[PDB]
Structures are given as C-alpha cells and as structure tokens.
C-alpha cells in the first residue's frame, strides 16, 4: 500500500519508528487549534 506494509518496517531503524510516533502526535494539537482559532478570528473581524 503506502504504510502498514512489511517493507517499510524492514527499511527504517527500530529507534526511528519510536521517535516518529511521538513527534507526529504533537502536530495534531497545534493544527486542530489552528482551524478553531480561524473560526473565532472570523467573528472577531466581524466585531
């Protein structure tokens, strides 16, 4: 496919897989908050 395949597990290092899982989680908080802040920013411009 593009993930979940055996090849990719073999290809990367085991350590790097642990660091990648942590790093990516963090991005989600900030992106989701980015969308909300815009939705509010719209009301603020209207005010």
């Amino acid at each position: 496919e593009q993930d979940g395949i055996g090849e990719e597990v073999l290809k990367m290092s085991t350590e790097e897989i642990v660091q990648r899982t942590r790093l990516l989680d963090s991005e989600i908080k900030i992106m989701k908050s980015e969308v909300l802040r815009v939705t509010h920013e719209l009301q603020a411009m209207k005010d």
Binding site: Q2, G4, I17, E27, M31, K32, L42
Partner: protein, 37 residues
C-alpha cells in the same frame, strides 16, 4: 498486523488524511477572512 511497528505505520496514514482534511476546512474559513479584511 505482524509487528507493533506496522500498527504505528497505519496511524501515520490516518494523520496524512487528517492533515489534508483540516487543510480543506481551514482554506474555506480563510477565504471568508479575506473579504472581512
């Protein structure tokens, strides 16, 4: 699947889709800002 490492891989994909899904909303709400500015 056969590795925890694969469980991990499958989560990256949901996030790739997630990053996209948000970007579409974000841009629709953004256009609206431009008119107000």
């Amino acid at each position: 699947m056969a590795d925890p490492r694969d469980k991990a891989l499958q989560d990256y994909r949901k996030k790739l889709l997630e990053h996209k899904e948000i970007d579409g909303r974000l841009k629709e709400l953004r256009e609206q800002l431009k008119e107000l500015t």
